[PDB]
Write a structure and sequence with these properties.
This is part of a larger assembly, with 1 copy of chain A (about 170 residues), 2 copies of chain B and 1 copy of chain C (about 170 residues).
Chain A: E1 3-4, E2 35-37, E3 43-45, E4 47-49, H1 51-69, H2 76-82, H3 86-101, H4 108-120, H5 129-138, H6 143-149, H7 152-155, H8 161-171
Antiparallel strand pairs in A: 2-3
Chain B: H1 2-5, H2 16-33, H3 35-44, H4 51-69, H5 73-79, H6 81-84, E1 88-89, E2 95-96, H7 103-133, H8 140-147, H9 152-165, H10 167-175, H11 185-192, H12 196-202, H13 205-214, H14 228-238, H15 248-264, H16 267-280
Antiparallel strand pairs in B: 1-2
Chain C: E1 2-13, H1 22-34, E2 38-39, E3 43-48, E4 60-61, E5 68-79, E6 85-95, E7 98-103, E8 106-111, E9 120-122, E10 129-131, E11 136-137, E12 142-152, E13 157-162, E14 169-170
Parallel strand pairs in C: 8-13
Antiparallel strand pairs in C: 1-5, 2-3, 3-5, 4-5, 6-7, 6-12, 7-8, 9-10, 10-11, 12-13, 12-14
The chains are: A mainly alpha (about 170), B mainly alpha (about 280), C mainly beta (about 170).
Organism (chain D): Komagataella phaffii (strain GS115 / ATCC 20864) (Yeast)
Family (chain D): Belongs to the SPT6 family.
Protein name (chain D): Transcription elongation factor Spt6
Chain lengths: ~170, ~280, ~170, ~160
């Protein structure tokens, strides 16, 4: 139904192996490529979202819509009930339940610090945004465990993986 | 049919002690289920003494047939129904037949023997776990609740109690590595911390268990000479090196939650609540 | 995995709605028709950012049918699983053929052939579960699984998980 | 699976089964399976083939009486005939006694068949004797045997 900003893609003869979806190989397909275009056609990077960032964004947008619908005058159940559509209500309920029951960072400032650490780091300047989201989401504790769960980080050995993991564990609220 | 029933059952041939325990458990299960039938039979045929004893004997014989001799239900009903009915004579010496069981009861026998064969492995696993614990003093609660253990829920309660009160020992025995977080790590830290003596001083565990089992006061819970906040703060100040807590209120909350966990993992409270709910509970929607 | 995407929708409006409240009505129609839907190409659209300030542009009158056609561009949060990805889950059902878990709106089915052998299914347990000596996974239990395959339907996505590798199973 | 294998073995051996004992002798089954299924499977007896006493097709094979109780059925038949010459171990005489009782060569002068005379036997005495001799509660079994002799496979 909804159409992406990427169009064309007409017939050719060559066939490529970087077309199939694969998280381990970091092949996310054309619609999830590293380079995207906005409504103005300017350069844009793929925007991944960790569960903390996703929860913050969904809560902010939902509460903004709820405030707007009431003339600009917190509960997840009420917030889900704000939306229209029984199937939409169920889907947003399930997403909210997942995010709440696996929220590593429920505070705006903790998520901001985590994003700053995972973005401004010299080692992380090469890290793929999908890798960053996976690291902030799965909450791994060990370099070996992270490498096993994320095969992409195995080839990136120029990363201070263990100390970054310890920093995330520190930032994680016990 | 028996092969299909026993396909999931890896170990079927029980020992003689296990066999007798299975027979007793099956008899008790039938008595619980057929309580109305047994009561009506006893009330109507009150003249005959120990009709239910003959019922237990017949149930034991039927279980013997099905297990040892591998007899299907219709064969038993067509050629061994003499055991299933007790012919007594009244005051007039008229031969009166008493249908103690029906074919549906034989199907119930098969289902119950399968159920006990299933739970036998679980009870053996709990016994092996307890033996691996190798307690210096045999826990009276363990013995008391294991002797009366009939349902797998009670076995799970035993497992929870043993794991909670021997979390360090159980973790060591597991060690005797996937970094799974032990849910009892906080309680182990409390045990290692200097505030654990305060938790002892709240109430004696053995005295609490004796009082609860007796259902009446055998000992009086002695109140410590200083308030919980007083003792917590004093120990925190005198053991700042070892007290992992930050504030006295945090230690107070940790002590309260540890006491709540201790009370929750007590098998007797769970058993009493379960009996009360099963007896007098209601259903609301 | 969650993402931010710039999506576009074609909205057709009947002439009976050609009133002053046309723009707001288009906004709520877009919200009702996009929020919660499931497209195989993108996955699941969960929310639309800035839902009350979306530009709709000028609608074009379809020749011969009167209805106006609007091109609506918006930014939305989208979740889509990928092959070979390890995510958290909550078990929703236990069955002899396998157990069903839930990863947000997606329901994932894991067959016994993708489960470690020591986690023998126990139907006698209450509730029935796939349990081992040190592991017990039942309804409501947190599980860490790796998505192996995804099946595309008309407006649904079916994923298959596995716990047979390391750092998987119960968590 | 077991029924398919059994019917295949029977078909390979021949057109029909001779008697219940052949289910064991011809290696058609094991022991417990045979004991369970013994009374529930039967072969239709025919007085036309009964002419030879050496007939392997036992008449009791067309009854609900278990093969393990064929001797008891023979003893009851001898009890009804009131013939004390035959002892408890002359199985050929018991077979001839059943032959006479169920299919007499001379039809009875009255309308009461020799199987009817089984009603005069007291089942309680025989049950008590069996329980004393070998500790067996078989009074219901004796009743079933008497019923089967009175009518072969009455519809239930």
């Amino acid at each position: 139904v909804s159409t992406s900003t990427v169009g064309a893609r007409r017939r050719r003869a060559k066939q490529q192996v970087d077309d199939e979806e694969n998280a381990t190989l970091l092949r996310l397909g054309p619609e999830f490529a590293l380079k995207q275009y906005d409504h103005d056609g300017n350069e844009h990077d793929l925007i991944a979202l960790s569960l903390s960032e996703s929860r913050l964004l969904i809560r902010e947008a939902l509460k903004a819509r709820s405030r707007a619908r009431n003339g600009g005058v917190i509960d997840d159940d009420e917030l889900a009930k704000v939306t229209s559509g029984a199937v939409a209500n169920g889907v947003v309920k399930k997403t909210l339940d997942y995010l709440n029951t696996f929220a590593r960072f429920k505070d705006e400032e903790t998520c901001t610090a985590v994003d700053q650490l995972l973005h401004n780091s010299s080692d992380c300047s090469v890290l793929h945004p999908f890798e960053i989201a996976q690291l902030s989401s799965l909450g791994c504790e060990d370099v070996d465990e992270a490498i096993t769960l994320i095969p992409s980080l195995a080839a990136k050995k120029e990363v201070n993986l263990q100390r970054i993991l310890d920093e995330l564990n520190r930032l994680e609220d016990p | 049919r028996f092969q299909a029933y026993r396909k999931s059952i890896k170990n079927y041939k029980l020992s003689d002690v296990d066999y007798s325990n299975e027979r007793d458990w099956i008899v008790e299960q039938l008595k619980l289920e057929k309580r109305d039938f047994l009561q009506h039979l006893t009330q109507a045929h009150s003249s005959v003494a120990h009709l239910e004893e003959k019922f237990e004997a017949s149930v034991k014989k039927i279980v013997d047939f099905i297990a040892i001799e591998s007899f299907e239900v219709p064969f038993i009903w067509n050629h061994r129904r003499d055991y299933a009915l007790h012919t007594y004579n009244d005051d007039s010496n008229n031969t009166i037949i008493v249908k103690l069981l029906n074919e549906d009861d034989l199907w119930r026998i098969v289902q119950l023997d399968l159920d006990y064969h299933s739970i036998h492995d679980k009870k053996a696993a709990l016994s092996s776990i307890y033996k691996q614990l190798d307690l210096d003093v045999v826990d009276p609660t363990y013995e008391e609740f294991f002797g009366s253990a009939r349902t797998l829920s009670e076995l799970q309660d035993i497992d929870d109690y043993l794991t909670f009160n021997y979390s360090s020992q159980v973790k060591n025995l597991t060690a005797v590595m996937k970094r799974k977080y032990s849910k009892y790590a906080i309680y182990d830290r409390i045990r290692q911390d200097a505030i654990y003596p305060v938790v002892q001083s709240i109430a004696n565990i053995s005295q609490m268990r004796e009082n609860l089992a007796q259902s009446k006061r055998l000992h009086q819970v002695e109140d410590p000479i200083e308030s919980p906040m007083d003792m917590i703060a004093d120990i925190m100040s005198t053991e700042k090196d070892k007290t992992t807590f930050i504030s006295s209120e945090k230690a107070y909350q940790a002590v309260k939650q540890f006491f709540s966990e201790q009370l929750s993992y007590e098998p007797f409270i769970r058993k009493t609540i379960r009996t009360a709910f099963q007896s007098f509970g209601v259903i609301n929607i | 995995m969650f993402f931010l995407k710039d999506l576009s929708l074609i909205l057709t409006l009947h002439p009976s709605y050609f009133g002053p409240q046309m723009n707001q009505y288009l906004r709520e129609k877009l919200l009702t028709d996009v929020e919660g839907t499931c497209t195989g190409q993108f996955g699941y659209i969960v929310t639309v950012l800035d839902g009350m300030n979306i530009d709709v542009g000028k609608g074009r009158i379809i020749p011969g049918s009167g209805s106006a056609e609007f091109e609506v561009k918006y930014r939305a949060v989208v979740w889509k699983p990928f092959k070979g990805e390890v995510v958290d889950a909550i078990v929703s059902n236990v069955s002899p053929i396998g157990f069903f878990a839930d990863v947000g709106p997606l329901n994932v089915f894991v067959s016994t052939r993708l489960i470690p052998d020591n986690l023998v299914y126990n139907p006698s347990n209450s509730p029935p579960a796939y349990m081992s000596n040190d592991e017990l996974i039942t309804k409501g239990s947190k599980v860490r699984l790796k998505v192996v395959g995804t099946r595309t339907d008309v407006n649904e996505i079916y994923a298959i998980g596995s716990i047979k590798e390391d750092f998987l199973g119960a968590i | 699976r077991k029924a398919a294998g059994l019917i295949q073995s029977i078909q390979r051996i021949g057109s029909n089964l001779v008697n219940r004992a052949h289910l064991i002798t011809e290696q058609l089954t094991s022991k417990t399976v045979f004991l369970n299924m013994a009374s529930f499977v039967y072969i239709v007896f025919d007085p036309d083939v009964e002419r030879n006493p050496q007939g392997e097709m036992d008449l009791l094979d067309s009854t609900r009486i278990h093969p393990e109780d064929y001797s008891l059925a023979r003893k009851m038949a001898a009890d009804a005939l009131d013939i004390e010459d035959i002892d408890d171990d002359d199985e050929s005489a018991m077979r001839n006694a059943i032959y006479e009782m169920v299919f007499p060569r001379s039809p009875p002068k009255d309308e009461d068949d020799l199987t009817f005379k089984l009603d005069e036997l007291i089942l309680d005495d025989y049950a008590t004797e069996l329980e004393r001799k070998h500790q067996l509660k078989k009074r219901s079994t004796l009743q079933i045997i008497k019923e089967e002799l009175q009518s072969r496979y009455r519809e239930i």
